[PDB]
Amino acid sequence: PAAPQVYTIPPPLEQMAKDLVSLTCMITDFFPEDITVEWQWNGQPAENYKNTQPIMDTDGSYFVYSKLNVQKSNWEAGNTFTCSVLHEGLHNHHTEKSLSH
Amino acid sequence: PAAPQVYTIPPPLEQMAKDLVSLTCMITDFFPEDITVEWQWNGQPAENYKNTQPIMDTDGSYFVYSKLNVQKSNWEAGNTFTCSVLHEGLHNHHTEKSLSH
């Protein structure tokens, strides 16, 4: 199996004028398609996120995007957001990547 | 209708060590779901990109991600990449956002 590459992306600059911002977790280059993605807020389970369905890339691998919505004040307040991933190609089948303002 | 918000995202810093990088086009907050997304390279049609299927967000709107893979030398060489979007909520149903190293 090919372990996924996990990248965390902050809100686009042009989105900083809105009251609600979006955090992105970009997961690429994995195989097989079976995977689980979840978000956490300061260690606690978050709920306002949506994951896309796995798409096969040009090279036969898969990729998925997960978008979490949060109040702009929550982001600039400096809270910590974590993207949690479950996949059989990872060391012990799990990994995490955190984001902070 | 609700016109989509189009955001262009460069490759994550940790991905700059690989030979292949990814450019992301983040399209959010639109309605209805019908939408067309395409990528261009210096004004010409590109081919190595994949779009996710529209996902209904918490507020009833939709969002889509489009990922274009390019050689790291192509990016650092300074070529121009453009993300084109067709949606009935936009002025004349079309808009563009460009990216450059």
Question: Residues of A65-76 as b/e, b for ≥16 C-beta within 10 angstroms?
Answer: bbbbbbebeebe
Please answer whether residues B53 and A52 qualify as being in contact, where contact means their C-beta atoms are separated by less than 8 angstroms. yes
Cis peptide leading into A4, omega within 30 of 0? Answer: no
For residue B10, give both structure tokens: 């460069």
Let me know: does B25 contact B6? Beta carbons within 8 Å.
yes
**What's the sign of the alpha-carbon dihedral B87, B40, A16, A37?**
positive
Q: Cβ(B37)–Cβ(B84) under 8 Å?
A: yes
Rounded to a whole number of angstroms, the distance from the CA of B99 to the nearest CA of chain A is: 13
CB B30 within 8 A of CB B61: yes
Q: Which residues contact A56 (CB under 8 A, 6 or more apart)?
A: A33, A62, B50
Calculate how close chain B gets to A77, using CA atoms only, in Å. 23
Cβ-proximal residues to A60 (8 Å cutoff; 6+ apart), any chain: A31
> What experiment produced this structure?
X-ray
> CA B87 to CA B100: how far, in whole Å?
24
Helix (H, G, I), strand (E, B) or coil at A99: strand
- Are A57 and B65 a contacting pair at CB < 8 A? no
Please give the residue of chain A at the shortest CA–CA distance from B12: A7
The beta-carbon contacts of B71-77 under 8 Å, at least 24 apart in sequence, are B71/B19, B71/B20, B71/B21, B72/B16, B72/B18, B72/B19, B72/B20, B72/B21, B75/B11, B75/B21, B75/B23, B75/B101, B76/B101, B77/B101
* Residue pair A9/A24 in contact by the 8 Å Cβ criterion: yes
Q: Considering only CA atoms, which of A26, A31, A22, A27 is closest in space to residue A2?
A: A31
Question: Nearest residue on chain A to B28, judged by CA atoms?
Answer: A22
**The residue to which tokens 């060391």 are assigned:** A91
d(CA B84, CA B93): 11
Q: How far apart are CA A16 and CA A100, in angstroms?
A: 15
DSSP B17: T
**A23-46: burial string, b at 16+ Cβ within 10 Å, e else:** bbbbbbbbbeeebebbbbbeeeeb
CA distance B30 to B3: 5
Other Cβ atoms less than 10 A from the Cβ of B71: the count is: 11
Tokens of residue A100, six digits: 């902070």
Confirm if B7 and B85 have CB atoms less than 8 A apart. no
Cα–Cα–Cα angle for B54, B56, B60, rounded to 5 degrees = 140
Instruction: Name the domain count of chain A.
Output: 1
Q: Taking phi first (over 0 means left), then psi (-120 to 50 degrees means alpha), and beta for anything else, what does residue A67 get?
A: beta
The helix (H) or strand (E) run that includes residue B70 is strand B62-71
Resolution at which this structure was determined, Å: 2.2
Distance of alpha carbon B4 from alpha carbon A97, whole angstroms: 28
B79 to chain A, minimum CA–CA distance in Å?
A: 21
Whichever domain contains A52, its CATH number is 2.60.40.10
Q: Which domain holds residue B67?
A: 1-101
Contact between B56 and B50 (Cβ < 8 Å) = no
Beta strands in A1-101 (DSSP E): 5-9, 20-30, 36-41, 44-45, 49-51, 55-56, 62-71, 80-86, 94-100
